[PDB]
Design a protein around this ligand. Structure first.
Ligand SMILES: NC(=O)c1ccc[n+]([C@@H]2O[C@H](COP(=O)([O-])OP(=O)(O)OC[C@H]3O[C@@H](n4cnc5c(N)ncnc54)[C@H](O)[C@@H]3O)[C@@H](O)[C@H]2O)c1
Ligand SMILES: NC(=O)c1ccc[n+]([C@@H]2O[C@H](COP(=O)([O-])OP(=O)(O)OC[C@H]3O[C@@H](n4cnc5c(N)ncnc54)[C@H](O)[C@@H]3O)[C@@H](O)[C@H]2O)c1
Ligand SMILES: NC(=O)c1ccc[n+]([C@@H]2O[C@H](COP(=O)([O-])OP(=O)(O)OC[C@H]3O[C@@H](n4cnc5c(N)ncnc54)[C@H](O)[C@@H]3O)[C@@H](O)[C@H]2O)c1
Ligand SMILES: NC(=O)c1ccc[n+]([C@@H]2O[C@H](COP(=O)([O-])OP(=O)(O)OC[C@H]3O[C@@H](n4cnc5c(N)ncnc54)[C@H](O)[C@@H]3O)[C@@H](O)[C@H]2O)c1
Lengths: 233, 247, 247, 233
C-alpha cells in the first residue's frame, strides 16, 4: 500500500546515510522527492527514478537563508508543493570542550538547527494552504546519554526537540504534524541495547513513513527513539 | 497484509480502543482472540465480516486460573500467539482519603497483573518461534496533574516500567515490547463517566490538535508497532494524544 | 536545624540509604521512627548520640496490620509524623522465564503497597496540621537497559507514578510528594549481591562522575526536599547518580 | 549555615527577577557576587552590600564574545576566581511563527544559548584549576507544555538542557557539576498546578543554593522542575 502517493517530500541531507534511505523509502511509498544537499546525489536520483517517481536534487547549503529561499522556490515551481519536510541535514564532529571554539559552536547550530527553521519558513505556507503537512526532524539518542566531546552537538540535537515540540503547537490547527526521530549509533558511509545489533539506515525508514502517513495524523510534538531499546524516555 | 498468517490476543477487546485495535489487526490479515469480562458480539461480527477468524472468551485477565485456561483455548484453536495487546484496565475516580487498600490492590490486579499473567502464557511460544509483539496500553495521565487517581496512575506507570523491563528481557528473542499512551479518548465508558466533562475542554485547550480523540486515532500506531517497520523499536512509550504531552 | 521539632518516619532505615537518611535528618534536628524487618542498633545509637530521640520497630511494611500497629506506636510516642521516607524495598535478580506470579506479587507488596499503606497512616496527621513531606525511593534502572528485573523495575516505575499522583492529591494541603533515584549505591546488601561486579565498571564508565556512589551522596538531596527550600517542588523525581541518566 | 562562604558566584541577568533573587540568596549563603547585565543593578548591589558580601556589577551584553571575554577578565582580576556560574540571562517575547523572522530567531539564540557557552569558556578554566565548580543553567517548563508563539523561545530552552547534559559529561571528572532549573510562569517585574499559587522568584532560590552546595556534588546533568507540581518528567 502506497501511503504517500502523490505527496511531495523534501529531504535535506538526502545524498547519503539516513537521508538517502528515507528518501528512497518514501519513493517506494509513492512520493516524489526533492533533495537538498552540499554534494550531488547520483545514487539517490538513480534509485528514485527506477521506482517510477519524480526526483529533484540541488546543491544547497541548508544553513544559508539565500540557498534555502532559492531551493524553496525551485521546489514550488518544479512540483508546485511540499507536503512533507524531513530535516535530516546535520554534522556531528567529536570535539573536546577545551578545543571547542565559538566559531565551531555557531557553525554547528547554523547547520543542525537553523536549517530546520529556514526550511519550515519556506514550506509551511504551502502546507497551510492545502490544510495538510508533515514535518519530521532528526535528533539523536545522545541527548539522553553520557558521552564526552559533544557539547556543541548535543546542544543542537536538543534544540531540534524543542523546535519539534513548539512548532507542533503552532501548526496543530492547520492539519500539520511536527515530530522527531532519534536514531542510535547508525552505520552510514561516514559514521547496552535490548536488541543486540548495530543500527542501519533502513531501521529508521519504517518510523519515518509511519509518521508521514494518515496513521499518525493525531501524533504531533513527539520524539520517537529508534535505537534497539537502549534509551528509555 | 502486514499481519497475514498471524494470531493476535487482545484483552479488553470487546469495546472502545481494544475493539478498534482488534478490528484493525484483522483488516491487516490477522486472526483474533479476545479476552474480556463482557461479550464481544459486535467485535466478532466485524472481524468475521472481514474474512478472518475470531475467538471471544469471557475471562478475568486478573485471575491466574482464567488466563491459563484462556491460553490453552487459544493454542488448541489457532495454534500460537504472535501479537499480545494488553489493553484491559479500569480507572474509577477515587480520593486518596477514601481509597482503601482493597480498591488499591484490585486496581493493580486488573491493570498490572493481567499484563504479567498474559505475557507468561504467550511469551514462550513467541520465543520458541523467534518472533513476537507485546503492546501495552498506558495513559498520558502519567505526565499530568490530575487528582483522585493515585491508584490508577501508579498502575499506568507500572505498565510503562513493565514495558521497559520486559523489552530488555526479550530483546534477543525477536520480540519487541512497547506501550501506547492515549489522551482522553471517546468511548462508551468515558462518555458515561465523569471525564465526559472534559470532552470539550481538554481537546481544544491543552492539545495541539483541537479535536476529541476517537479509537481510530490509535489503530495506526498499534498496527505500526506490531509490524516489521518497528522491529528495531522496543521499550518505548508512544503518546498518541494530539500533542498534549511531550516526553 | 532545618528539621527542628519534627518527626520523621523512615522505612528500611536500619542499613544503607535509609539509615544514612535517618542519621542526616537527626543531625538537622529531627526525631526518628524507623520501621524495618531487622533490628537497627547501629542506627539508634548514632541518632541518640546526636541528641535526638529514636524509635525502632520490627515491622513488615507490606502488611496492613503491622503498618497500622506501627502508626499507633509512633503517635503515642512522638505525637505526629511530619516527614515520611518510603525507602523499604527488595531487588532480587530473576529471569522472566523463571519469574512466578508469587514472586511478582510479593515484590509489589514490599516495594509498592508499603508506600501506600504508610501514606494512609500518616497523611491524615500531616493534612490536619497543614504540613508534610513524603519522599519515595525509586531507581535509575527505570531508564536503563538491564535484564532479569521486570518485577523490580515495574515496581520502581509504580513508585514514580505513586509520587506524581499523590502530589496532585495533596498539593493543596501543604504537603509535597517527591522521589529520589539513586545509581548503583555501595551498601551491605549490594556488596554481597550480584551487582557487586559493576562496582568498578558502571561508575567510571557510564557515569559523568567516575566514583562509586555511597549513602552520604543521597542525604543532601533528601534533607533538601524535606525542607522549606523545596516547598514549591512536588511530584518530581530527582536522580542522584553521578550524571548517568538524563530525563 | 553558610554553604557558599568564600565562593565567588557569577550571575548573568542578575539585575532583576530570578537572577536578582538568586544573587541575593547566594549572598545570604556567604558568597560574593559578580553580576553581568545590560542595565545597572542598583537594587542588587545595595541588597548584597547590606549582607556584608562583595559585589561587582557590569553593563555587559552576554551575547557578545567581546563583552563576555572582558567581563571574564574583570571578574578574575577583581576576585581572582569564579566558583559558581549561573546562566540566567534570557528573553521570552511571544511571537507567532508566521511573524518570526530569521533575525529574531538568531537573536533569541545568541542571548539565550550563546551566552551560556561564552561564559562557560571564560570560567571553566579556573574551576578546573581549583578542581571545583558549579554551573547552573536556567531553562523553562514550557519545554514540556503545549503553548503557541514560542518556537524560537522553546527551541533555545531545550538547547539549554542539552548544553547542561553534555557539558556535564565533559567536566564530570574535574569536580564540576552542571545542572539546570526549569521554573514555571514566575512573577517578575517584567513577566493546572498541584500547588495552587502563582510562582515568585524566591521559589527558585532554594533549589539554586542546594545545587551550588556540597549536598549536590554527586548531582550533575539534571534538570530540576520547580513549578508547583505542574510538569512531570
Ligand atoms: N550517524 C549517526 O550515528 C547519527 C546518530 C544520531 C543522530 N544522527 C543525525 O542524523 C542526521 C545525519 O544522518 P547521517 O548519519 O546519515 O549523515 P550522513 O553521513 O548522511 O551525512 C549528512 C548528510 O547531510 C549533508 N549535509 C551536511 N551539511 C549540509 C548542508 N549545510 N546543506 C545540505 N546538506 C548538508 C551531507 O552532504 C550528507 O549527505 C543528523 O541530523 C544527525 O544529527 C545521526
Ligand atoms: N479511554 C481513555 O480515554 C483512556 C485514556 C488513557 C488510558 N486508557 C487505557 O486504555 C484501556 C481501556 O481503553 P477503553 O476505554 O477504550 O476500553 P473500554 O471502554 O472498552 O473499557 C475497558 C474494557 O476492558 C474490559 N475489562 C476491564 N477489566 C477486565 C478484566 N478483568 N478482564 C477482561 N476485560 C476487562 C472491559 O470489559 C472493557 O471491554 C485501559 O487499559 C486504560 O487504562 C484509556
Ligand atoms: N542500593 C542501591 O544501589 C539502590 C539503587 C536503586 C534503588 N534502590 C532502592 O533503595 C532502597 C534500598 O536502599 P538500600 O540498598 O541502601 O537499603 P539496605 O541495603 O539497608 O536494604 C534494604 C532495607 O530494607 C529493609 N526491608 C526490606 N523489606 C522490608 C519490609 N518488608 N519491611 C521493613 N523493611 C524492609 C531491609 O531490612 C533493609 O534494611 C529500595 O527501595 C531500593 O529499591 C537501591
Ligand atoms: N519569567 C518567567 O515566567 C520564566 C519562565 C521560565 C523560564 N524563565 C527563564 O528565566 C530567565 C529569566 O529570568 P526572569 O524571568 O527573572 O527575567 P527578568 O525579567 O529578570 O529579565 C532578564 C534579565 O536578564 C537581563 N538580560 C537580557 N538580555 C541580556 C544580555 N544580552 N546581557 C546581559 N543581561 C541580559 C535583563 O536586563 C534582566 O535583568 C530566562 O533564562 C528565561 O528563559 C523565566
Amino acid at each position: 500500500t502506497q501511503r504517500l502517493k502523490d505527496k511531495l517530500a523534501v529531504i535535506t541531507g538526502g545524498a547519503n546515510g539516513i537521508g538517502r534511505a528515507i528518501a528512497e523509502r518514501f519513493a517506494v511509498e509513492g512520493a516524489d522527492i526533492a533533495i537538498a544537499d552540499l554534494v550531488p546525489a547520483p545514487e539517490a536520483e538513480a534509485a528514485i527514478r527506477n521506482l517510477g517517481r519524480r526526483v529533484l536534487t540541488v546543491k544547497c547549503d541548508v544553513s544559508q537563508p539565500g540557498d534555502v529561499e532559492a531551493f524553496g522556490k525551485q521546489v514550488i515551481s518544479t512540483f508546485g508543493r511540499c507536503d512533507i519536510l524531513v530535516n535530516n541535514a546535520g554534522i556531528y564532529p567529536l570535539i573536546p570542550f577545551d578545543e571547542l571554539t565559538f566559531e565551531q559552536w555557531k557553525k554547528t547550530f547554523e547547520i543542525n538547527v537553523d536549517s530546520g527553521f529556514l526550511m519550515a519558513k519556506a514550506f509551511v505556507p504551502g502546507m497551510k494552504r492545502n490544510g495538510w503537512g508533515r514535518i519530521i526532524n532528526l535528533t539523536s539518542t545522545t541527548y539522553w546519554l553520557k558521552i564526552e566531546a559533544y557539547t556543541h552537538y548535543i546542544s543542537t540535537k536538543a534544540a531540534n526537540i524543542g523546535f519539534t515540540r513548539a512548532l507542533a503547537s503552532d501548526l496543530g490547527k492547520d492539519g500539520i504534524t511536527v515530530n522527531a526521530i532519534a536514531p542510535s549509533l547508525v552505520r552510514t558511509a561516514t559514521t547496552l541495547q535490548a536488541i543486540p545489533r548495530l543500527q542501519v539506515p533502513l531501521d529508521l525508514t519504517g518510523a519515518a513513513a509511519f509518521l508521514a502517513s494518515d496513521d499518525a495524523s493525531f501524533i504531533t510534538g513527539q520524539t520517537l527513539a529508534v535505537d534497539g531499546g537502549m534509551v528509555r524516555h
